[PDB]
């Protein structure tokens, strides 16, 4: 029968006109049962209603439609391992959001995705229920309840068909672990998917670096226990033979630079086929081609394998593309940090030909900045242009301010407290401002520093620092004297290369010494300065203000920051007090470390530590007694008490201000002293020379798993500190401290590893060449921050 009206009963969301035009029927047109069915199907297919029921009321079709309910709210309970924000985002990705129509069917796929996500999080046996609670006016409350069960963990990473390499030596480099000791940070046992592919790639690279050019992973099987709490990963591989490099030939479109390319691709006769070195040569060729102005050079290295002589020949196809020119660089997402803070880390210059490696270099610099959580790149094309591009960077701003509070232990520091608050991006202008504080056993330190890392476009840094430093020499195993000081320093830093840096600056420091202990060297310094205190008095007071010019040079090339294996590191610091200050002197120190590898895998290493230092007064003055060098302890030479090595203090016949019976109080007349008497209280000379030869070897008694997480070594240390300005033949009854020939030696064994509590460093030492008066310490243990 003919139709002349549609009721649209219960249509609050979809507009009446929109619903009417959605169906393929117009008013006044003949309608049959087939037409009614087609209209119902079309309306259902619109994806806006859950049920369509049409009733023929008189001559008008009463189209009763069950509308799609809107998401009143979504309630989650029991997600103790996953925050509901990520669940909300996942629901958004599927279109289910508060205030959106709930189709009652896509929610099934959403809960399937949630169950898959829970599987991905390690909760394998968990259960998910997407219950729907009806609410008036066709509303739905979506209660995504679930039970997380218990997480699964890996139980074995087994490799079959491997020879010449134990499974332990191969599963170590995996980011996926199977045995994680409590006393050593090595990672979690949670199982992932992308990590498995990464580990298989790592295995491939490890086998290909050793010459096994025919290595091929047959397959990989992951299994679950019936209890569903244990993963079992097996990797069936097939290792070939150790091949050798027959030769490498470059072919293709070299852009007329065959000579340099051939020079770069040179190999010694009969070298081992190393995939890493092959890729390094490929990237060197890419760099050479790019430097001449090719944006997208192509290098395809195919190895041809001849088993007759067990040889591999590298056919490298080179194809330099076209030339592209970067029209302009854009930065997106930097709502806080200004454009300069991001555009000065770019090694690619706008308005110049394109280099992809340069873009990735700038990307890594932006990553190392620390301000940005994620930083992606896009070499977008300029519309209506053949060879012009724009290099867009999309950054997601991260937080910068942070306050930290650490605590550590040590034999040279007792218990050490550290606290501070830092802001590495002041209002997004590059300036970094921080407040730091430390409390040692014998000193306290408060610092406020503000640095501009880019004072010149080149990269010269300019920093300022205000410090208040209190020193209690009594607690530092030294002669009794308190020193409260405060000062401010302004410095400039010049970088020469990636492995060198100069620092030059000025500083002003005001010191105040009190409670000083009458002794020969300190009184000599005071006499030289111009003050003559009374030896009898125990409570003295002195204060000075000095302006100093500081210079320094640091060269750092260590291959690995933690547990180095190869490279040098030389630091040379120095200072001279400028005219117009109470003190007149200069000082210089030079500490060197050098790790030389002896094996091929960088497992057996030799560490050549050294430390020289010398300082002296310029005119008739003397170098301050609160700035002399020190030795012994754990830092300089193991096997001695902290600060013990060096000249000892000679005390005058003084009466202590506070005295208690049976207490030495530094050879006090109260105890009965009436003449100069030598003691074991170190004072510290003004010339220091220390050296140490250490052999680093793999730790013997430990599973080959995580065997590189503990560093074990045997050390032999030599040290000597002396006072050059000690008066010659001043007294025949005491040792000639000015003599430098006296050299102390020790030998021992040291261990280090990264415990959850921090970096732990144990050492047992024996000072077989200790001289008279030196305090002997044997077991030096440090529990890092």
């Amino acid at each position: 029968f003919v139709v002349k009206d549609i009721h649209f009963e219960g249509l609050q969301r979809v507009a009446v006109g929109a619903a009417l035009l959605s169906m393929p029927v117009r008013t006044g047109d003949t309608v049959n049962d087939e037409d009614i069915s087609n209209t119902i199907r079309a309306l259902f297919a619109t994806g806006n209603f859950e049920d369509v029921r049409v009733l023929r009321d008189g001559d008008t079709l009463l189209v009763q439609v069950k509308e799609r309910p809107t998401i009143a709210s979504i309630t989650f309970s029991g997600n103790k391992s996953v925050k509901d924000d990520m669940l909300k985002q996942n629901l958004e990705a599927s279109g289910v959001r508060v205030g959106e129509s709930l189709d009652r069917t896509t929610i099934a796929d959403i809960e399937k995705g949630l169950e898959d996500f829970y599987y991905s999080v390690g909760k394998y046996s968990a259960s998910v229920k997407a219950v729907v609670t009806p609410l008036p006016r066709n509303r739905v409350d979506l209660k995504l309840v679930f039970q997380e069960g218990v997480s699964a963990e890996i139980q074995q990473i087994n490799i079959v068909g491997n020879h010449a390499f134990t499974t332990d030596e191969l599963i170590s480099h995996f980011q996926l672990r199977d045995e994680v000791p409590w006393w050593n940070v090595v990672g979690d046992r949670k199982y992932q998917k992308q990590k498995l592919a990464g580990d298989l790639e790592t295995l491939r690279s490890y086998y290909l670096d050793r010459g096994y050019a025919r290595f091929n992973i047959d397959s990989t099987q992951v299994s679950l226990t019936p209890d569903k709490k244990g993963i079992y990963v097996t990797v069936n591989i097939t290792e070939g033979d150790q091949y050798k490099l027959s030769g490498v030939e470059v072919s293709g479109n070299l852009a007329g630079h065959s000579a340099e390319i051939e020079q770069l691709t040179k190999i010694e006769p009969g070298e081992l086929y190393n995939g890493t070195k092959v890729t390094k040569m490929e990237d060197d060729i890419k760099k050479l081609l790019g430097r001449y102005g090719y944006a997208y050079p192509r290098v395809q290295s195919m190895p041809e394998i001849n088993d007759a002589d067990k040889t591999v020949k590298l056919r490298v196809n080179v194809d330099a593309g076209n030339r592209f020119y970067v029209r302009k660089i854009r930065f997106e997402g930097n709502d806080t940090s200004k454009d300069a803070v991001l555009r000065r880390e770019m090694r690619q210059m706008e308005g110049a030909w394109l280099g992809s490696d340069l873009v990735d270099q700038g990307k890594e610099r932006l990553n190392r900045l620390g301000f940005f959580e994620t930083v992606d790149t896009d070499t977008q094309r300029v519309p209506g242009s053949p060879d012009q591009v724009d290099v867009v960077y999309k950054v997601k701003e991260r937080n910068t301010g942070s306050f930290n509070f650490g605590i550590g232990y040590g034999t040279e520091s007792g218990v050490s407290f550290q606290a501070g608050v830092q802001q590495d991006n002041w209002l997004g202008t590059g300036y970094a401002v921080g407040i730091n504080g430390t409390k040692n056993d014998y000193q306290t330190y408060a610092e406020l520093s503000v640095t501009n890392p880019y004072f010149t476009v080149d990269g010269v840094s300019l920093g300022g620092r205000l410090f208040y430093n209190d020193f209690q020499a009594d607690d530092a195993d030294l002669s009794d004297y308190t020193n409260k000081s405060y000062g401010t320093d302004v410095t400039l830093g010049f970088p020469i290369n990636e492995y060198n840096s100069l620092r030059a600056g000025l500083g002003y420091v005001h010191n105040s010494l009190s409670n000083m202990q009458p002794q020969v060297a300190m009184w000599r310094y005071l006499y030289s300065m111009g003050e003559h205190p009374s030896t009898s008095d125990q409570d003295n007071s002195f204060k000075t203000d000095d302006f100093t010019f500081n210079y320094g040079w640091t060269y750092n090339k260590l291959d690995r920051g933690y547990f180095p294996t190869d490279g040098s590191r030389v630091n040379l610091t120095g200072k001279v007090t400028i005219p117009g200050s109470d003190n007149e002197y200069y000082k210089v120190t030079l500490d060197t470390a050098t790790y030389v590898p002896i094996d091929d895998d960088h497992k057996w290493v030799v560490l050549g530590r050294t430390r020289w230092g010398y300082g002296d007064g310029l005119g008739g003055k003397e170098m301050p007694f609160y700035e002399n060098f020190y030795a012994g302890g754990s830092s300089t030479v193991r096997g001695f008490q902290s600060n013990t090595i060096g000249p000892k203090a000679v005390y005058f016949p003084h009466q202590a201000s506070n005295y208690d019976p049976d207490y030495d109080y530094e050879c006090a007349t109260q105890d009965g002293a009436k003449d100069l008497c030598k003691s074991d209280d170190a004072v510290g000379g003004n010339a220091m020379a220390v050296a140490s030869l250490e052999f680093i070897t793999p730790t013997p008694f430990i599973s080959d798993k995580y065997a590189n997480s503990v560093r074990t070594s045997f050390f032999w240390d030599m040290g000597t500190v002396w006072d050059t300005n000690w008066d010659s033949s001043q007294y025949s009854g005491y040792p000639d401290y000015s003599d430098p020939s006296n050299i102390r030696m020790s030998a021992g064994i040291a261990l280090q590893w990264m415990s959850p509590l921090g970096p732990l460093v144990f050492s047992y030492a024996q000072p077989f060449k200790k001289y008279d008066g030196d305090k002997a310490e044997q077991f030096q243990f440090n529990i890092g921050k």
Binding site: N399, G401, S402, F403, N404, F405, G406, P756, K785
Partner: peptide, 7 residues
């Protein structure tokens, strides 16, 4: 031990 909290 050392604890940092990026506020």
């Amino acid at each position: 031990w050392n604890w940092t909290k990026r506020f």
